[PDB]
């Protein structure tokens, strides 16, 4: 097979193929997640320079890995399908041998391992993808939110954003997220999430997806209207 070491060290101590994979993540549409008291909300930008799209059938940005865990990402889309597929298989394999679904920490650790392996295997380039993985461990009501990046490092977040202009929205989240007081309901948590995307997005038109995940495999996607009501209510308060 094709042998070449594509991920190697440079004299300053950097691995440029990994670092350039982050650049692709940087170019991807924004993604964000905020954990409430009793829920985790994943929200995603969808780029608007593309009308004539069919949204019943175009790949949705948040993906179910199991019935209790979800994954969103920023970066190369085709790359993300590979990580999603592997994670879903790992999820089913885990249930089979342990007789219990994956913890969010474990499933994160898996995806992260896959990503890292592609940074010191010959003949492969790293994944141009960073992920947000969110959900609730089986029989547990504490929300979880983790982030991965092409290097294979992963960690837990009270809230976090990846993709283009994710810096601007981390700014917003850093000044608007009280660790002492996390959004005490769904309603509030969704609100903070849409607010932060509206720092970067546009009209809150067909430009924002929101998924809400709750304890015991309770996941639901919001519709245009539902999202719109949040966008409407946010700007009316803005004339102040």
């Amino acid at each position: 097979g094709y042998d070449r070491a594509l991920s190697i060290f440079s004299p300053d101590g950097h691995i440029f193929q990994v670092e350039y994979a982050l650049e692709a993540v940087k170019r991807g549409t924004c993604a964000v997640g905020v954990k409430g008291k009793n829920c985790v909300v994943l929200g995603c930008e969808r780029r608007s320079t593309l009308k004539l799209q069919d949204t019943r059938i175009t790949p949705s940005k948040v993906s179910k890995i199991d019935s209790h865990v979800v994954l969103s990402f920023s970066g190369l889309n085709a790359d993300s399908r590979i990580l999603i597929e592997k994670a879903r298989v790992e999820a089913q394999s885990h249930r089979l041998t342990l007789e219990d679904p994956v913890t969010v920490e474990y499933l994160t650790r898996y995806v992260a391992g896959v990503q890292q392996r592609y940074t010191q295997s010959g003949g492969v380039r790293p994944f141009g993808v960073s992920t947000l993985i969110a959900g609730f461990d089986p029989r547990d009501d504490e929300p979880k939110l983790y982030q991965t990046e092409p290097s294979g490092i992963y960690s837990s977040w009270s809230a976090q954003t990846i993709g283009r202009n994710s810096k601007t929205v981390r700014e917003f989240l850093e000044k608007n997220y009280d660790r002492k007081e996390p959004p005490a309901t769904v309603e509030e948590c969704v609100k903070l999430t849409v607010r932060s995307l509206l720092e970067v997005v546009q009209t809150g038109a067909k430009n924002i997806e929101i998924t809400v995940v709750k304890p015991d495999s309770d996941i639901v996607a919001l519709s245009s209207e539902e999202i719109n009501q949040y966008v409407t209510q946010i700007e009316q308060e803005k004339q102040e």
Binding site: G1, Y2, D3, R4
Partner: protein, 250 residues
């Protein structure tokens, strides 16, 4: 040892060209003119048998090859690339078809097989594209007579008539002028012998011209009798003599 070349040698340039297919086509351009004309009841493929020395025996260098008893081919470009393709084309006709269905493949499919081989030389690790363009003329029961052109990229097109190689632009316009949809095979042979004369500089006779037809079934050419449904090959190579008779009433 072994192939350490497991990466493609044909890649996209920033302008979108595939350098090596382009260059292979350049090589075909320098090749000697060959052509094909489709008649209502036949096909003719013809080319110039340009020689190596007067000491070579050019009957041994056959540029027009039988693939199946109803398909023939001819080319322009690098002759040795052609030679191995004719070997591979004949085999795939058996392996991937006749051995499965008990009959020879139809022209379009065999062409597709050949084209597939040529495409792989355009993407696999550590090879260059083939430096030929082929013209394949065949007949099958449900499709009738056909003529195809296969390029180094693996692309193929069906033609009423065309020419490839050296003086092909000249040849193609000459053909446009005299091709109609009622040409009887003998007429198509006439036109081909005329079109080839333009591009042939030296001697022009039955020894300097290779030419073959996909026409009527040839029962005298079958080798055996007693099966009424086996009627003989439709491919026939014209003899040195047969070409010359046609050249007197030119």
């Amino acid at each position: 040892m072994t192939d350490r070349y497991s990466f493609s040698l044909t890649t996209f340039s920033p302008s979108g060209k595939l350098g090596q297919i382009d260059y292979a086509l350049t090589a075909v351009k320098q090749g000697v003119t060959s052509l094909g004309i489709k008649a209502t009841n036949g096909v003719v493929i013809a080319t110039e048998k340009k020689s190596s020395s007067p000491l070579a025996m050019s009957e041994t260098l056959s540029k027009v090859s039988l693939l199946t008893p109803d398909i023939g081919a001819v080319y322009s470009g690098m002759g040795p690339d052609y030679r191995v393709l004719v070997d591979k084309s004949r085999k795939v006709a058996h392996t991937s078809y006749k051995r499965i269905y008990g009959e020879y493949p139809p022209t379009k499919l065999l062409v597709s097989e050949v084209a597939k081989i040529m495409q792989e030389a355009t993407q696999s690790g550590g090879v260059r594209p083939f430096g030929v363009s082929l013209l394949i003329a065949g007949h099958d029961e449900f499709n009738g007579f056909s003529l195809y052109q296969v390029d180094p990229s693996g692309s193929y097109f069906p033609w009423k008539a065309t020419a490839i190689g050296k003086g092909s632009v000249a040849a193609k316009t000459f053909l446009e002028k005299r091709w109609n949809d009622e040409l009887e095979l003998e007429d198509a042979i006439h036109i081909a012998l005329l079109t080839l004369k333009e591009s042939v500089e030296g001697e022009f006779n039955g020894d300097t011209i290779e030419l073959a037809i996909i026409g009527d079934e040839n029962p005298d050419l079958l080798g055996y009798t007693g099966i009424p449904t086996d009627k003989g090959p439709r491919f026939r190579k014209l003899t040195s003599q047969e070409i010359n008779d046609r050249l007197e009433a030119l």
